[model samples]
Target: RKKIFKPEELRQALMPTLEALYRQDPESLPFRQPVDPQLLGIPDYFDIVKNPMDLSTIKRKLDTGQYQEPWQYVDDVWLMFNNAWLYNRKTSRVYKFCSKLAEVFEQEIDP
Candidate 1:
């Protein structure tokens, strides 16, 4: 398999899930929380069209039991996050860390 998903692959893998997450009710997700925005390292430049109020880092936080969300590591959250990044050029930092993302996803998420 490729080290990183192409933009098209990223879209196919998680874009629909992303859209649905936004469209659905808050109670619909596996869980919800009060995480600090600073924990995710989201860009200051990225526009806040809508609050995701999401748990894309659950795999990192819950899996590793660590702080400073590691975007380079793969998990369900990172996969969806990369899809979010691929969908929006302004929030594309996640795509730049594809190698580590793919490695962790393969080993931890989909192995």
Candidate 2:
């Protein structure tokens, strides 16, 4: 089973995910379209995808042992797999996709 990460680890993992995700074609991305482009980079074309949620919300959810929405988790995996196979992001930046989803599946199966 997968496991939830410590909040800082989860947050730290967001960086390369931000990089990889901003460039994804949502129509084609395994995950459904994330409505938040700001996460993808609000001001610039290729900044990075940052989680838009407040730090407290992120901390609360992680600390409280809450589960992610099922489809959201599913879609996130698709994005992870796509990044693994298609984008091949690991060479440069870390694939938080892989790391984070390990956390996602852990939470879901456990939850």
Candidate 3:
């Protein structure tokens, strides 16, 4: 059977994962907020990243009942990290953050 969650229950379940990402490390700092192209010195960010995702956006969606299933919430988290992986070099700090946090998120959701 497919698992479904009530809006409140979904928020309750998702908030901890979000908070865990935020508190994971200083590496997560760039991901906590929206990606600011000019601020981050990546003027080509919008040109490269079509669908930008971030922790705050995910939290807002969770709070506003935008997520009906757990997988939908998981998708946004993946998108957030994938965007980083797409834009950053493999050896870069941000890319490393994406890898670590994605692993952390996967564990949090599955374990």
Candidate 4:
């Protein structure tokens, strides 16, 4: 079997996982859309989170053929959760949500 997937095939394979992550739970609400630093009143968000990743952005990137490999897609999802960890306190609800989402993502993405 080929190790690498074509762009179309890659997109098809990743879509389910993406959907799973987005609709995982109400806890996913914060992550379903991109973080709005200004509206959220977190001016330092950009400074702390240098690379912001979100489910919507990942879907757009997949639709636009920005990912050439499966790992690239995986990395973005990981980055999304990691960014959440970075920005939110360990005791915060957002952090707890992120932890659950990350576990779900890991399970869904497992081969």
Candidate 5:
């Protein structure tokens, strides 16, 4: 199922994770910033495997949700995975977690 993150939920979820990333350059980081810009400076955040699928486009495609379209969730996971894959730097722990989340989201079952 697609997790609908309310604004507060989004802030809560990303804050600690982003804070950890910010910790990496504590000395140089001047002030708090948004995810995209804060991430822009980190090399590990940059994805080596660039893909055509993007998150916004995918989200737009699935504008409406219905249980009838279970595959829509799958579609979302795939695009989210692609987004993470593109922005991930192999050595980055944050990216590693991103990749792991993507992988977990796609799994049919775990043995």
Candidate 6:
């Protein structure tokens, strides 16, 4: 498939997505309820907005396991995250299917 930007695929991919988190500061990234605790924590997630980041590297730097928040990769797809948000599973699926990305969901693409 063509290297189409996933967030770009979304309506507001270009736009910045912002949400608050529990325990974290008011400006902190919104904590995503981990689908599987064995896999990770609620803090380790991303809210898939109308925009998926055009660059995965950027997603890695921001909205990742570090102390940073989701302010960076606001619209990126949550690959490492569960598919329940999307209701489908794919080998390379994040946020389940593209539709899940469309849904008001949160996921973690990576650490």
By lDDT, the best candidate is 3
Candidate 4, which segments miss by more than 4 Å at Cα? 1-7
Q: Which ten residues in a row have the lowest lDDT in candidate 6?
A: 19-28
Per-residue alpha-carbon lDDT of candidate 5 for residues 15-57, written as tens digits (9 for 90 to 100):
3433333343332122222235355665544345343343334
Clashes (backbone N, CA, C under 3 Å), per candidate, total 0, 2, 0, 0, 3, 5
Top TM-score model: 4
lDDT of 4 by residue, 1-111 (tens): 756445677767898788778786677889988999989999999999998999889988898778888789889999999999999999999999999888887788785
- TM-score (C-alpha, index-matched) for candidate 3: 0.87
Which lDDT tens digits does candidate 2 get at residues 1-111? 787645455434443433343344332232433324467443641234333332233334444444233344335445444443333356523344444444554554456
List the global CA lDDT of all models.
0.40, 0.40, 0.87, 0.87, 0.43, 0.33
Q: Is candidate 2 or 3 superior in lDDT?
A: 3
lDDT of 6 by residue, 33-100 (tens): 32443365533324432222322334333434331323434423343222334332454243233334
lDDT at position 72, candidate 2? 42
Superposed Cα deviation of residue 16, candidate 3 (Å): 2.8
Cα deviation in Å at residue 52, candidate 1? 14
Model 3, span 1-111: residue lDDT tens: 787556798877788788879888686887889999888688999988999999889988988888997789888999999899999999999999899898888788789
Regions of candidate 5 where Cα sits further than 4 Å from its true position: 1-68, 106-111
Which residue pairs show backbone clashes in model 4?
none
Clashing pairs in 3: none
Q: List TM-scores for all candidates, in order.
A: 0.26, 0.24, 0.87, 0.88, 0.38, 0.20
Arranged by TM-score, best first: 4, 3, 5, 1, 2, 6
